[PDB]
Paper text:
Mucinases of human gut bacteria cleave peptide bonds in mucins strictly depending on the presence of neighboring O-glycans. The [name] [name] mucinase cleaves specifically in between contiguous (bis) O-glycans of defined truncated structures, suggesting that this enzyme may recognize clustered O-glycan patches. [name] exhibits preference for bis-T over bis-Tn (GalNAcα1-O-Ser/Thr) O-glycopeptide substrates, with the first GalNAc residue being essential for cleavage. [name] follows a mechanism relying on a nucleophilic water molecule and a catalytic base Glu residue.
Initially, we chemoenzymatically synthetized a P-selectin glycoprotein ligand 1 ([name]-1)-like bis-T glycopeptide (hereafter P1 and defined by the sequence TEAQT**T**PPPA in which ** denotes a Galβ1-3GalNAc disaccharide) based on [name] substrate cleavage consensus motif determined by a previous mass spectrometry study. The truncated AM0627E326A (P71-E506) enzyme construct produced better diffracting orthorhombic crystals (space group P212121) in the presence of P1 and ZnCl2. The crystal structure of AM0627E326A was solved at 1.9 Å using zinc single-wavelength anomalous dispersion (Zn-SAD; see the “Methods” section). The model obtained from SHELXE26 allowed us to solve the structure of the AM0627E326A–P1–[name]+ complex at a higher resolution (1.5 Å) by molecular replacement using PHASER27. The AM0627E326A crystal structure revealed two distinct domains formed by an Ig-like fold domain and the M60-like catalytic domain. In addition, a water molecule did not coordinate the zinc ion and therefore did not replace the role of the P1 Thr5 carbonyl group in coordinating the metal. However interestingly, in our structure, we observed the presence of a potential catalytic water molecule, further discussed below, which was visualized in the active site establishing hydrogen bonds with the Thr5 carbonyl group, the acetamide NH group of the GalNAc located at G1, and the NH group of Thr6. The Glu2 side chain makes a hydrogen bond with the Asp292 side chain, the Ala3 methyl group establishes CH–π interactions with the side chains of Trp149/Phe290, and Gln4 forms hydrogen bonds with Arg291 (both side chain and backbone). Regarding the two glycosylated Thr residues (Thr5 and Thr6 in Fig. 3a), the Thr5 backbone forms a hydrogen bond with the Tyr470 side chain, the Thr5 methyl group forms a CH–π interaction with the Tyr287 side chain and the Thr6 backbone makes a hydrogen bond with the Tyr287 side chain. Additional enzyme–substrate interactions involve the two contiguous T O-glycans (bis-T) of P1.
Residue numbers in the entry:
A (entry chain H): 1 to 8
B (entry chain A): -3 to 0, 71 to 506
Amino acid sequence: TEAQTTPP
Amino acid sequence: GGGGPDYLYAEYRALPSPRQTGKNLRIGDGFSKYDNMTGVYLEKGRHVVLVGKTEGQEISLLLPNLMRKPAEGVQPTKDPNGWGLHKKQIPLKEGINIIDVETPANAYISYFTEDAGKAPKIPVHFVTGKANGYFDTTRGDTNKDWVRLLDQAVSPIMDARGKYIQVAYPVEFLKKFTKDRGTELINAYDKLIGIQYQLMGLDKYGKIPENRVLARVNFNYYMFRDGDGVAYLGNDGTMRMVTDPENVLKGDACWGFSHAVGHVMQMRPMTWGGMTEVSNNIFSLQAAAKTGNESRLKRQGSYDKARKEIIEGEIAYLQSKDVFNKLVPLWQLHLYFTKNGHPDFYPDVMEYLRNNAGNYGGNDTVKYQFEFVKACCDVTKTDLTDFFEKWGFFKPGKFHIGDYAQYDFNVTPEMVEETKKWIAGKGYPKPETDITELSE
Ligand SMILES: *[C@H]1O[C@H](CO)[C@H](O)[C@H](O[C@@H]2O[C@H](CO)[C@H](O)[C@H](O)[C@H]2O)[C@H]1NC(C)=O
Ligand SMILES: *[C@H]1O[C@H](CO)[C@H](O)[C@H](O[C@@H]2O[C@H](CO)[C@H](O)[C@H](O)[C@H]2O)[C@H]1NC(C)=O
Ligand SMILES: [Zn+2]
Protein backbone atom coordinates (compact mmCIF):
# COMPACT_ATOMS: atom_id res chain seq x y z
CA THR A 1 0.00 0.00 0.00
CA GLU A 2 0.96 3.78 0.06
CA ALA A 3 -1.57 4.99 2.67
CA GLN A 4 -2.05 8.71 3.61
CA THR A 5 -4.38 9.05 6.67
CA THR A 6 -6.24 11.10 9.30
CA PRO A 7 -5.76 9.79 13.10
CA PRO A 8 -8.95 10.76 14.94
CA GLY B 1 -25.29 -7.10 -27.01
CA GLY B 2 -27.98 -9.77 -26.34
CA GLY B 3 -25.39 -12.65 -26.10
CA GLY B 4 -26.76 -13.80 -22.71
CA PRO B 5 -28.15 -12.88 -19.30
CA ASP B 6 -27.75 -9.31 -17.99
CA TYR B 7 -24.28 -8.78 -16.36
CA LEU B 8 -23.14 -12.38 -17.07
CA TYR B 9 -22.84 -11.30 -20.76
CA ALA B 10 -21.59 -7.76 -21.43
CA GLU B 11 -19.26 -5.88 -23.82
CA TYR B 12 -16.33 -3.99 -22.22
CA ARG B 13 -14.83 -0.78 -23.64
CA ALA B 14 -11.14 0.06 -23.06
CA LEU B 15 -10.48 2.90 -20.60
CA PRO B 16 -7.44 5.20 -20.55
CA SER B 17 -4.50 3.99 -18.40
CA PRO B 18 -5.23 5.18 -14.80
CA ARG B 19 -1.47 5.62 -14.21
CA GLN B 20 -1.18 7.82 -17.36
CA THR B 21 -4.25 9.91 -16.36
CA GLY B 22 -2.61 10.53 -12.93
CA LYS B 23 0.83 11.29 -14.45
CA ASN B 24 -0.73 13.94 -16.81
CA LEU B 25 -2.37 15.69 -13.79
CA ARG B 26 0.90 15.35 -11.70
CA ILE B 27 -1.11 13.36 -9.07
CA GLY B 28 0.29 9.80 -9.33
CA ASP B 29 -1.62 6.53 -8.79
CA GLY B 30 -5.21 6.93 -7.53
CA PHE B 31 -7.84 6.28 -10.26
CA SER B 32 -9.85 3.06 -10.17
CA LYS B 33 -8.19 -0.09 -11.54
CA TYR B 34 -11.65 -1.74 -10.99
CA ASP B 35 -13.72 0.78 -13.07
CA ASN B 36 -14.89 -1.90 -15.60
CA MET B 37 -17.06 -3.58 -12.93
CA THR B 38 -19.10 -6.59 -14.14
CA GLY B 39 -21.91 -7.02 -11.58
CA VAL B 40 -20.88 -10.72 -11.57
CA TYR B 41 -20.13 -12.71 -8.39
CA LEU B 42 -17.88 -15.80 -8.63
CA GLU B 43 -18.36 -18.42 -5.87
CA LYS B 44 -15.42 -20.63 -4.77
CA GLY B 45 -14.73 -23.27 -7.48
CA ARG B 46 -13.87 -23.72 -11.17
CA HIS B 47 -15.32 -21.07 -13.51
CA VAL B 48 -15.54 -20.63 -17.28
CA VAL B 49 -15.17 -17.13 -18.77
CA LEU B 50 -15.66 -16.68 -22.54
CA VAL B 51 -13.84 -13.75 -24.18
CA GLY B 52 -14.71 -12.39 -27.66
CA LYS B 53 -12.32 -10.92 -30.28
CA THR B 54 -9.47 -9.10 -28.43
CA GLU B 55 -7.62 -7.93 -31.63
CA GLY B 56 -4.50 -8.80 -29.54
CA GLN B 57 -5.42 -6.21 -26.80
CA GLU B 58 -4.34 -6.98 -23.17
CA ILE B 59 -7.42 -7.77 -20.96
CA SER B 60 -7.44 -9.37 -17.49
CA LEU B 61 -9.81 -10.37 -14.67
CA LEU B 62 -9.54 -8.77 -11.19
CA LEU B 63 -10.95 -10.63 -8.16
CA PRO B 64 -10.40 -8.30 -5.18
CA ASN B 65 -10.81 -9.49 -1.58
CA LEU B 66 -12.97 -6.52 -0.53
CA MET B 67 -14.21 -8.44 2.57
CA ARG B 68 -10.65 -9.20 3.81
CA LYS B 69 -10.60 -9.00 7.61
CA PRO B 70 -7.83 -9.25 10.18
CA ALA B 71 -7.36 -12.79 11.57
CA GLU B 72 -9.00 -13.57 14.98
CA GLY B 73 -7.27 -11.63 17.81
CA VAL B 74 -5.31 -9.45 15.28
CA GLN B 75 -5.76 -5.72 16.03
CA PRO B 76 -7.01 -4.26 12.72
CA THR B 77 -4.19 -1.65 12.30
CA LYS B 78 -1.58 -4.37 13.25
CA ASP B 79 -2.66 -6.70 10.40
CA PRO B 80 0.33 -8.52 8.81
CA ASN B 81 -1.69 -8.40 5.52
CA GLY B 82 -1.54 -4.55 5.68
CA TRP B 83 -4.35 -2.16 4.66
CA GLY B 84 -4.18 -2.61 0.84
CA LEU B 85 -6.82 -4.11 -1.46
CA HIS B 86 -5.62 -7.69 -2.04
CA LYS B 87 -6.66 -9.23 -5.40
CA LYS B 88 -6.09 -12.08 -7.85
CA GLN B 89 -5.34 -10.79 -11.38
CA ILE B 90 -5.80 -13.41 -14.15
CA PRO B 91 -4.77 -12.64 -17.75
CA LEU B 92 -7.64 -13.46 -20.17
CA LYS B 93 -7.29 -14.83 -23.73
CA GLU B 94 -9.78 -14.84 -26.64
CA GLY B 95 -12.12 -17.87 -26.29
CA ILE B 96 -12.46 -20.24 -23.29
CA ASN B 97 -10.77 -19.31 -19.96
CA ILE B 98 -10.78 -21.80 -17.03
CA ILE B 99 -10.36 -19.94 -13.71
CA ASP B 100 -10.03 -21.48 -10.24
CA VAL B 101 -11.56 -19.12 -7.63
CA GLU B 102 -10.22 -19.90 -4.08
CA THR B 103 -12.20 -17.08 -2.33
CA PRO B 104 -15.63 -15.87 -3.56
CA ALA B 105 -15.23 -12.49 -5.32
CA ASN B 106 -16.98 -9.82 -7.33
CA ALA B 107 -15.45 -9.71 -10.83
CA TYR B 108 -13.92 -6.61 -12.47
CA ILE B 109 -12.54 -6.48 -16.02
CA SER B 110 -9.14 -4.72 -16.42
CA TYR B 111 -9.16 -3.33 -19.99
CA PHE B 112 -6.89 -0.28 -20.29
CA THR B 113 -5.22 1.16 -23.43
CA GLU B 114 -3.00 4.06 -24.67
CA ASP B 115 -5.43 4.60 -27.66
CA ALA B 116 -8.83 4.35 -25.79
CA GLY B 117 -10.90 5.57 -28.81
CA LYS B 118 -9.38 2.94 -31.21
CA ALA B 119 -9.69 -0.27 -29.06
CA PRO B 120 -12.47 -2.82 -29.77
CA LYS B 121 -15.40 -3.47 -27.38
CA ILE B 122 -14.63 -7.00 -26.02
CA PRO B 123 -17.51 -9.32 -25.09
CA VAL B 124 -16.95 -11.24 -21.83
CA HIS B 125 -19.45 -13.95 -20.78
CA PHE B 126 -19.24 -15.31 -17.18
CA VAL B 127 -21.12 -18.51 -18.16
CA THR B 128 -20.74 -19.96 -14.56
CA GLY B 129 -21.20 -16.64 -12.64
CA LYS B 130 -24.11 -15.21 -10.60
CA ALA B 131 -25.60 -11.80 -11.47
CA ASN B 132 -25.16 -9.49 -8.45
CA GLY B 133 -25.87 -6.46 -10.68
CA TYR B 134 -24.57 -2.97 -9.95
CA PHE B 135 -26.06 0.50 -9.44
CA ASP B 136 -25.23 3.09 -12.13
CA THR B 137 -26.79 6.58 -11.94
CA THR B 138 -25.40 7.38 -15.46
CA ARG B 139 -27.47 4.44 -16.87
CA GLY B 140 -30.72 5.99 -15.52
CA ASP B 141 -31.01 3.78 -12.40
CA THR B 142 -33.35 5.08 -9.64
CA ASN B 143 -33.80 4.34 -5.92
CA LYS B 144 -36.30 1.61 -7.00
CA ASP B 145 -33.36 -0.15 -8.73
CA TRP B 146 -31.12 0.52 -5.66
CA VAL B 147 -33.59 -1.21 -3.27
CA ARG B 148 -33.98 -4.19 -5.67
CA LEU B 149 -30.19 -4.55 -6.07
CA LEU B 150 -29.60 -4.62 -2.26
CA ASP B 151 -32.55 -7.02 -1.69
CA GLN B 152 -31.47 -9.43 -4.53
CA ALA B 153 -27.68 -9.29 -3.90
CA VAL B 154 -25.82 -12.64 -3.97
CA SER B 155 -22.54 -10.96 -2.80
CA PRO B 156 -21.74 -9.24 0.51
CA ILE B 157 -20.51 -6.30 -1.70
CA MET B 158 -22.60 -4.05 -3.94
CA ASP B 159 -20.83 -2.16 -6.74
CA ALA B 160 -22.11 1.29 -7.70
CA ARG B 161 -21.00 4.18 -9.89
CA GLY B 162 -21.87 7.73 -10.82
CA LYS B 163 -20.15 10.10 -13.26
CA TYR B 164 -16.90 10.33 -11.22
CA ILE B 165 -17.28 7.90 -8.28
CA GLN B 166 -17.09 4.12 -8.04
CA VAL B 167 -18.22 2.53 -4.72
CA ALA B 168 -17.66 -1.00 -3.36
CA TYR B 169 -19.36 -1.26 0.07
CA PRO B 170 -21.04 -4.08 2.00
CA VAL B 171 -24.78 -4.56 1.34
CA GLU B 172 -25.28 -4.73 5.18
CA PHE B 173 -24.10 -1.10 5.62
CA LEU B 174 -25.88 0.19 2.48
CA LYS B 175 -29.18 -1.24 3.81
CA LYS B 176 -28.59 0.14 7.34
CA PHE B 177 -27.36 3.69 6.55
CA THR B 178 -28.11 4.52 2.88
CA LYS B 179 -31.50 2.71 3.07
CA ASP B 180 -33.42 3.55 -0.17
CA ARG B 181 -31.26 6.66 -0.98
CA GLY B 182 -28.72 5.21 -3.50
CA THR B 183 -29.17 8.11 -5.96
CA GLU B 184 -28.62 10.69 -3.19
CA LEU B 185 -25.45 8.89 -2.00
CA ILE B 186 -23.85 8.53 -5.45
CA ASN B 187 -24.87 12.13 -6.32
CA ALA B 188 -23.26 13.36 -3.03
CA TYR B 189 -20.00 11.52 -3.88
CA ASP B 190 -20.04 12.93 -7.47
CA LYS B 191 -20.64 16.44 -6.05
CA LEU B 192 -17.66 16.11 -3.67
CA ILE B 193 -15.29 14.86 -6.42
CA GLY B 194 -16.62 17.46 -8.91
CA ILE B 195 -15.80 20.27 -6.45
CA GLN B 196 -12.16 19.08 -6.55
CA TYR B 197 -12.09 18.73 -10.38
CA GLN B 198 -13.45 22.31 -10.64
CA LEU B 199 -10.83 23.71 -8.20
CA MET B 200 -8.10 21.80 -10.16
CA GLY B 201 -9.32 23.55 -13.37
CA LEU B 202 -10.15 20.22 -15.04
CA ASP B 203 -13.54 21.57 -16.26
CA LYS B 204 -11.92 24.85 -17.45
CA TYR B 205 -8.99 23.13 -19.30
CA GLY B 206 -10.98 20.13 -20.68
CA LYS B 207 -9.11 17.57 -18.54
CA ILE B 208 -11.96 15.92 -16.55
CA PRO B 209 -10.79 12.29 -16.27
CA GLU B 210 -12.83 9.48 -17.85
CA ASN B 211 -11.40 7.25 -15.07
CA ARG B 212 -13.45 7.06 -11.86
CA VAL B 213 -12.19 7.27 -8.26
CA LEU B 214 -12.93 4.14 -6.18
CA ALA B 215 -14.26 4.48 -2.61
CA ARG B 216 -13.94 1.03 -1.02
CA VAL B 217 -14.71 -0.48 2.35
CA ASN B 218 -11.77 -1.87 4.32
CA PHE B 219 -11.50 -3.68 7.69
CA ASN B 220 -8.16 -2.18 8.86
CA TYR B 221 -8.44 1.62 9.36
CA TYR B 222 -10.96 4.49 9.74
CA MET B 223 -10.25 6.53 6.53
CA PHE B 224 -7.26 6.62 4.19
CA ARG B 225 -6.03 7.05 0.62
CA ASP B 226 -3.73 4.65 -1.24
CA GLY B 227 -2.91 3.82 -4.87
CA ASP B 228 -6.39 2.21 -5.32
CA GLY B 229 -8.29 5.37 -4.20
CA VAL B 230 -10.02 6.02 -0.86
CA ALA B 231 -10.94 3.50 1.82
CA TYR B 232 -13.44 3.66 4.70
CA LEU B 233 -13.69 1.31 7.69
CA GLY B 234 -16.58 -1.21 7.56
CA ASN B 235 -17.90 -0.43 11.05
CA ASP B 236 -21.12 1.33 12.08
CA GLY B 237 -19.20 4.45 13.24
CA THR B 238 -17.48 5.16 9.90
CA MET B 239 -20.22 3.78 7.58
CA ARG B 240 -22.80 6.04 9.34
CA MET B 241 -20.55 9.03 8.44
CA VAL B 242 -19.95 8.20 4.74
CA THR B 243 -22.80 5.86 3.56
CA ASP B 244 -25.66 8.10 4.85
CA PRO B 245 -26.05 10.67 2.02
CA GLU B 246 -27.13 13.45 4.45
CA ASN B 247 -24.22 12.78 6.86
CA VAL B 248 -21.47 12.69 4.20
CA LEU B 249 -22.32 16.32 3.17
CA LYS B 250 -22.08 17.56 6.83
CA GLY B 251 -19.21 18.65 9.09
CA ASP B 252 -16.45 16.16 9.90
CA ALA B 253 -17.88 13.42 7.55
CA CYS B 254 -17.74 15.88 4.60
CA TRP B 255 -14.24 16.94 5.75
CA GLY B 256 -12.99 13.33 6.06
CA PHE B 257 -14.37 12.24 2.65
CA SER B 258 -13.08 15.43 0.96
CA HIS B 259 -9.67 15.10 2.72
CA ALA B 260 -9.23 11.46 1.56
CA VAL B 261 -10.22 12.28 -2.06
CA GLY B 262 -7.99 15.40 -1.69
CA HIS B 263 -5.04 13.02 -1.22
CA VAL B 264 -5.94 11.42 -4.59
CA MET B 265 -6.13 14.90 -6.23
CA GLN B 266 -3.18 16.76 -4.58
CA MET B 267 -0.57 17.51 -7.29
CA ARG B 268 3.17 16.91 -6.72
CA PRO B 269 4.00 20.61 -7.48
CA MET B 270 1.74 21.63 -4.51
CA THR B 271 2.78 18.64 -2.32
CA TRP B 272 6.52 18.94 -1.69
CA GLY B 273 7.85 17.25 1.48
CA GLY B 274 5.84 18.47 4.51
CA MET B 275 2.73 19.31 2.42
CA THR B 276 1.12 15.81 2.27
CA GLU B 277 -1.42 16.71 5.03
CA VAL B 278 -1.60 20.38 3.88
CA SER B 279 -2.33 20.77 0.14
CA ASN B 280 -5.25 18.30 0.13
CA ASN B 281 -7.13 20.45 2.72
CA ILE B 282 -7.56 23.23 0.12
CA PHE B 283 -10.11 20.74 -1.34
CA SER B 284 -11.62 20.10 2.15
CA LEU B 285 -12.14 23.85 2.71
CA GLN B 286 -13.61 24.36 -0.81
CA ALA B 287 -15.96 21.34 -0.28
CA ALA B 288 -17.10 22.91 3.05
CA ALA B 289 -17.74 26.28 1.31
CA LYS B 290 -19.79 24.56 -1.46
CA THR B 291 -21.88 22.40 0.98
CA GLY B 292 -22.98 25.06 3.53
CA ASN B 293 -20.39 23.88 6.11
CA GLU B 294 -18.40 26.27 8.30
CA SER B 295 -14.68 26.86 7.53
CA ARG B 296 -12.49 24.69 9.81
CA LEU B 297 -9.83 27.48 9.80
CA LYS B 298 -12.54 29.86 11.16
CA ARG B 299 -13.79 27.28 13.75
CA GLN B 300 -10.19 26.60 14.99
CA GLY B 301 -9.12 30.31 14.97
CA SER B 302 -6.26 29.09 12.70
CA TYR B 303 -5.51 32.54 11.12
CA ASP B 304 -4.32 33.99 14.47
CA LYS B 305 -2.55 30.69 15.42
CA ALA B 306 -0.69 30.55 12.07
CA ARG B 307 0.33 34.25 12.14
CA LYS B 308 1.59 33.70 15.75
CA GLU B 309 3.62 30.56 14.87
CA ILE B 310 5.14 31.52 11.49
CA ILE B 311 4.99 35.34 11.01
CA GLU B 312 5.49 36.52 14.65
CA GLY B 313 7.87 33.54 15.24
CA GLU B 314 9.89 34.64 12.11
CA ILE B 315 10.38 30.91 11.20
CA ALA B 316 10.56 29.26 7.75
CA TYR B 317 7.26 27.96 6.33
CA LEU B 318 9.23 24.65 6.16
CA GLN B 319 9.72 24.86 10.01
CA SER B 320 5.95 25.04 10.81
CA LYS B 321 4.85 22.12 13.05
CA ASP B 322 1.09 22.46 12.38
CA VAL B 323 -0.59 21.36 9.10
CA PHE B 324 -3.50 23.81 9.67
CA ASN B 325 -1.03 26.72 10.15
CA LYS B 326 0.66 25.74 6.83
CA LEU B 327 -2.82 25.62 5.16
CA VAL B 328 -3.69 29.22 6.22
CA PRO B 329 -1.59 31.09 3.56
CA LEU B 330 -2.80 28.65 0.82
CA TRP B 331 -6.43 29.48 1.71
CA GLN B 332 -5.76 33.23 2.17
CA LEU B 333 -4.59 33.28 -1.51
CA HIS B 334 -7.89 31.63 -2.58
CA LEU B 335 -10.16 33.87 -0.43
CA TYR B 336 -8.26 37.06 -1.47
CA PHE B 337 -8.03 36.39 -5.24
CA THR B 338 -11.52 34.86 -5.73
CA LYS B 339 -13.15 37.94 -4.05
CA ASN B 340 -10.83 40.49 -5.84
CA GLY B 341 -11.63 39.58 -9.48
CA HIS B 342 -9.69 36.29 -9.97
CA PRO B 343 -12.41 33.64 -9.41
CA ASP B 344 -10.33 30.96 -11.29
CA PHE B 345 -7.23 31.43 -9.03
CA TYR B 346 -6.50 27.75 -8.11
CA PRO B 347 -7.89 26.35 -11.42
CA ASP B 348 -5.31 28.56 -13.22
CA VAL B 349 -2.45 27.95 -10.70
CA MET B 350 -2.91 24.16 -10.94
CA GLU B 351 -3.08 24.28 -14.81
CA TYR B 352 0.05 26.53 -14.76
CA LEU B 353 1.93 24.01 -12.59
CA ARG B 354 0.73 21.04 -14.75
CA ASN B 355 2.21 22.82 -17.83
CA ASN B 356 5.30 24.51 -16.27
CA ALA B 357 6.47 22.77 -13.03
CA GLY B 358 9.61 20.61 -12.98
CA ASN B 359 9.94 16.88 -12.24
CA TYR B 360 11.40 16.51 -8.69
CA GLY B 361 11.50 13.72 -6.11
CA GLY B 362 12.71 13.48 -2.50
CA ASN B 363 14.95 16.34 -1.32
CA ASP B 364 14.56 18.14 -4.72
CA THR B 365 10.77 18.62 -4.09
CA VAL B 366 11.53 21.86 -2.16
CA LYS B 367 12.08 23.44 -5.65
CA TYR B 368 8.27 23.17 -6.02
CA GLN B 369 7.79 25.64 -3.11
CA PHE B 370 9.44 28.33 -5.32
CA GLU B 371 7.66 27.14 -8.54
CA PHE B 372 4.36 27.48 -6.57
CA VAL B 373 5.28 31.09 -5.62
CA LYS B 374 6.10 31.89 -9.30
CA ALA B 375 2.80 30.33 -10.51
CA CYS B 376 0.72 32.41 -8.01
CA CYS B 377 2.44 35.63 -9.22
CA ASP B 378 2.24 34.85 -12.99
CA VAL B 379 -1.43 33.68 -12.93
CA THR B 380 -2.59 36.85 -11.09
CA LYS B 381 0.09 39.25 -12.55
CA THR B 382 0.58 40.29 -8.88
CA ASP B 383 3.87 40.77 -6.97
CA LEU B 384 3.26 38.49 -3.93
CA THR B 385 6.89 38.84 -2.65
CA ASP B 386 5.75 40.46 0.67
CA PHE B 387 3.05 37.79 1.32
CA PHE B 388 5.43 34.82 0.76
CA GLU B 389 8.25 36.65 2.64
CA LYS B 390 5.99 37.18 5.73
CA TRP B 391 4.85 33.50 5.63
CA GLY B 392 8.53 32.37 5.72
CA PHE B 393 8.74 30.96 2.14
CA PHE B 394 12.06 32.79 1.46
CA LYS B 395 14.03 31.78 4.64
CA PRO B 396 17.28 30.07 3.54
CA GLY B 397 18.57 27.10 5.58
CA LYS B 398 18.77 23.32 6.00
CA PHE B 399 15.32 22.05 7.03
CA HIS B 400 14.55 18.49 8.20
CA ILE B 401 10.91 17.39 7.69
CA GLY B 402 9.22 14.12 8.67
CA ASP B 403 6.29 13.64 6.20
CA TYR B 404 5.82 9.85 5.82
CA ALA B 405 9.32 9.94 4.20
CA GLN B 406 12.26 11.94 5.70
CA TYR B 407 13.21 15.17 3.84
CA ASP B 408 16.44 17.17 4.15
CA PHE B 409 15.88 20.40 2.21
CA ASN B 410 18.72 22.79 1.39
CA VAL B 411 17.20 26.23 0.58
CA THR B 412 20.27 28.26 -0.54
CA PRO B 413 20.36 32.09 -0.59
CA GLU B 414 20.86 31.74 -4.42
CA MET B 415 17.53 29.81 -4.73
CA VAL B 416 15.66 32.53 -2.74
CA GLU B 417 17.39 35.42 -4.61
CA GLU B 418 16.69 33.77 -8.06
CA THR B 419 12.92 33.53 -7.20
CA LYS B 420 12.70 37.11 -5.77
CA LYS B 421 14.55 38.52 -8.87
CA TRP B 422 12.25 36.51 -11.25
CA ILE B 423 9.19 38.11 -9.51
CA ALA B 424 10.78 41.63 -9.47
CA GLY B 425 11.60 41.35 -13.24
CA LYS B 426 7.87 40.89 -14.10
CA GLY B 427 7.08 44.46 -12.86
CA TYR B 428 3.68 43.36 -11.49
CA PRO B 429 1.71 45.56 -9.05
CA LYS B 430 1.84 44.68 -5.31
CA PRO B 431 -1.50 44.05 -3.53
CA GLU B 432 -2.99 47.28 -2.02
CA THR B 433 -3.58 45.43 1.33
CA ASP B 434 -1.54 42.94 3.42
CA ILE B 435 -3.04 39.55 2.35
CA THR B 436 -1.46 37.92 5.50
CA GLU B 437 -4.03 39.90 7.61
CA LEU B 438 -7.00 38.11 5.89
CA SER B 439 -9.16 36.15 8.42
CA GLU B 440 -12.63 34.59 8.29
C1 LIG C 1 -8.74 13.70 8.35
O1 LIG C 1 -10.14 13.34 8.41
C2 LIG C 1 -10.67 13.21 9.77
C3 LIG C 1 -12.15 12.82 9.67
O2 LIG C 1 -12.67 12.45 10.97
C4 LIG C 1 -10.48 14.47 10.60
O3 LIG C 1 -11.29 15.53 10.11
C5 LIG C 1 -9.00 14.87 10.52
O4 LIG C 1 -8.74 16.11 11.24
C6 LIG C 1 -8.81 15.89 12.66
O5 LIG C 1 -10.10 16.39 13.03
C7 LIG C 1 -10.42 16.13 14.41
C8 LIG C 1 -11.84 16.70 14.64
O6 LIG C 1 -12.77 16.03 13.78
C9 LIG C 1 -9.40 16.84 15.31
O7 LIG C 1 -9.58 18.26 15.18
C10 LIG C 1 -7.97 16.45 14.90
O8 LIG C 1 -7.04 17.23 15.64
C11 LIG C 1 -7.74 16.67 13.39
O9 LIG C 1 -6.41 16.22 12.98
C12 LIG C 1 -8.55 15.02 9.06
N1 LIG C 1 -7.14 15.40 9.10
C13 LIG C 1 -6.68 16.57 8.61
C14 LIG C 1 -5.19 16.84 8.76
O10 LIG C 1 -7.37 17.35 7.96
C1 LIG D 1 -2.39 9.21 9.74
O1 LIG D 1 -1.63 8.03 10.09
C2 LIG D 1 -0.34 7.99 9.42
C3 LIG D 1 0.39 6.67 9.75
O2 LIG D 1 -0.32 5.56 9.19
C4 LIG D 1 0.53 9.18 9.85
O3 LIG D 1 0.89 9.07 11.24
C5 LIG D 1 -0.20 10.52 9.60
O4 LIG D 1 0.50 11.61 10.27
C6 LIG D 1 1.42 12.36 9.47
O5 LIG D 1 2.74 11.82 9.72
C7 LIG D 1 3.83 12.53 9.08
C8 LIG D 1 5.14 11.98 9.66
O6 LIG D 1 5.63 10.93 8.84
C9 LIG D 1 3.77 14.05 9.31
O7 LIG D 1 4.15 14.37 10.68
C10 LIG D 1 2.37 14.58 9.01
O8 LIG D 1 2.27 16.00 9.27
C11 LIG D 1 1.40 13.83 9.89
O9 LIG D 1 0.10 14.40 9.74
C12 LIG D 1 -1.61 10.49 10.16
N1 LIG D 1 -2.27 11.73 9.67
C13 LIG D 1 -2.25 12.88 10.38
C14 LIG D 1 -2.91 14.08 9.74
O10 LIG D 1 -1.73 13.00 11.49
ZN1 LIG E 1 -4.50 12.98 5.36
